[PDB]
Design a protein around this ligand. Structure first.
Ligand SMILES: [Mn+2]
Length: 70
């Protein structure tokens, strides 16, 4: 799993990480993401940051944490 269990369990690709706490303009990955490296590269291909967020759907703004090692 590319995100931790619990609250911040959903991988999204978000345009901006605000305050290391919020994802803005969050897109669902268009592929299965198997590893941190794939998650990072996939979100970068969409001009976005790999974040682990409180909900799994596309959204304007969500509480998120950065993917580990980023
Ligand atoms: Mn927006």
């Amino acid at each position: 799993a590319v995100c931790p269990t619990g609250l911040f369990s959903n991988p999204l690709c978000c345009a901006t990480n605000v305050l290391d706490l919020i994802g803005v303009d969050c897109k669902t990955p268009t592929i299965a993401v198997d590893t941190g490296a794939i998650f990072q590269a996939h979100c970068a291909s969409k001009g976005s940051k790999p974040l682990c967020c409180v909900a799994p759907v596309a959204d304007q703004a969500l509480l998120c944490q950065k993917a580990i090692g980023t």
